[PDB]
């Protein structure tokens, strides 16, 4: 199924995914398109940051969902 990611510049990209994909798998796919390492990526959907070890179906992420990609400013 096809989902969307709103990237760091606001540009929207598509990802091809399955409901059983882990959040790690999703980050690897974003890395394939954007070059950002998974360990720097944070993904927000429906008001919640998505956790490594869970799946898209755990968050009820269906086709056409928009994930919001952000990084970090540590302090």
């Amino acid at each position: 199924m096809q989902i969307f990611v709103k990237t760091l510049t606001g540009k929207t990209i598509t990802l091809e995914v399955e409901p059983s994909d882990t959040i790690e798998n999703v980050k690897a796919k974003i890395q394939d398109k954007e070059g950002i390492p998974p360990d720097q990526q944070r993904l927000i959907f429906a008001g919640k940051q998505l956790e490594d070890g869970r799946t898209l179906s755990d968050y009820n992420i269906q086709k056409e969902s928009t994930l919001h990609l952000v990084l970090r400013l540590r302090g």
Partner: protein, 311 residues
């Protein structure tokens, strides 16, 4: 009857402090937290610790001082493996973690629908994707507790927020899989705000990834934040918001820095830097818009904005 108290830093905990201060000055949040304290049980969790802390601030004998959030920080480190360390962290990651953690506690208690966390911070977007080949429009509603908006040099948050909801055309590699066409097609995609939240928290995406350099930098761009914002709903037609707090990241880069918060209280501005609280003039807030020139240098940049609806 107000009380202005800094918070002790317990090992790179400014990211927590700055968010706690912003939240203290989000009136509906502080009120729900204090009402929670008023009814609460003996079982300790992150919310009961937050409530004890807020109550402590609200009931100090003097009008000015410093409070140690020792119990809150211990509990934070116990509950969340992510924050179970003494390293520097992101304030926005902490904000969203804290809100959802509280919300989960509140939901669990209802089961012995929306919690008050959602009443305060939750809005809804309607994403519309329109296939340019068959003209079919597909709509999908998605909630949020905050909006992460992209930035550019010498702009305003009003423009950032509008760009968030502007129509994007998807071509080539971003083509949309249309279920009527059963194939990838060019499309228009727009995320509109269906419902505006009571408090709108805006997170500025002040970071840029350099593919060739294999790292990212902090964007210290000038991004103006107005004191009031008029925002519109898709289906009240609009809502006026006032700025009540800004979490500010100080540092030239994304891997290290410090956090402070500016808040509005009874028509003046206060700066909270861990244990230090100072009054600041309305005009000195402009420093936090970001840097005009020499932009790879150290900046004190607004990062999370809290807008409170007038009704």
């Amino acid at each position: 009857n107000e009380h202005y108290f800094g918070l002790v830093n317990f090992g790179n905990t400014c990211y927590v402090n700055s968010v706690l201060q912003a939240l203290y000055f989000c009136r509906p949040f502080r009120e729900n937290v204090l009402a929670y304290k008023a009814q609460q049980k003996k079982k300790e969790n992150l919310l009961t610790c937050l409530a004890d802390l807020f109550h402590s601030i609200a009931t100090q004998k003097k009008k000015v001082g410093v409070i140690p959030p020792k119990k809150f920080i211990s509990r934070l480190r116990k509950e969340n493996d992510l924050f179970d360390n003494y390293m520097q962290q992101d304030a926005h990651e902490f904000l969203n973690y804290l809100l959802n953690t509280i919300a989960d506690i509140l939901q669990e208690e209802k089961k012995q629908e929306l919690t008050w966390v959602h009443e305060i911070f939750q809005g809804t977007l309607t994403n519309e994707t329109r296939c340019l080949n068959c003209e079919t429009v597909s709509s999908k509603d998605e909630d949020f507790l905050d909006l992460s908006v992209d930035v550019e040099q010498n702009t305003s948050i009003t423009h950032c927020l509008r760009d968030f909801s502007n129509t994007e055309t998807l071509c080539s590699e971003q083509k949309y899989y249309c279920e009527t066409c059963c194939s990838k097609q060019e499309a228009q995609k727009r995320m509109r705000v269906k419902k505006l939240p009571m408090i709108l928290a805006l997170h500025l995406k002040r970071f840029k990834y350099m593919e060739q350099l294999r790292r990212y930098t902090k964007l210290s761009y000038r991004v103006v934040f107005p004191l009031e914002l008029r925002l519109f709903n898709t289906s009240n037609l609009d809502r006026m918001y006032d700025l009540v707090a800004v979490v500010v990241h100080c540092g030239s880069g994304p891997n290290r820095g410090h956090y402070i918060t500016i808040v509005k209280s009874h028509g003046f501005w206060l700066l909270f830097d861990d244990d230090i609280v100072e009054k600041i003039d309305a005009q000195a807030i402009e420093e936090f818009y970001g840097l005009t020139s020499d932009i790879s240098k150290n900046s004190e940049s607004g990062y999370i904005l809290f807008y409170q609806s007038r009704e």
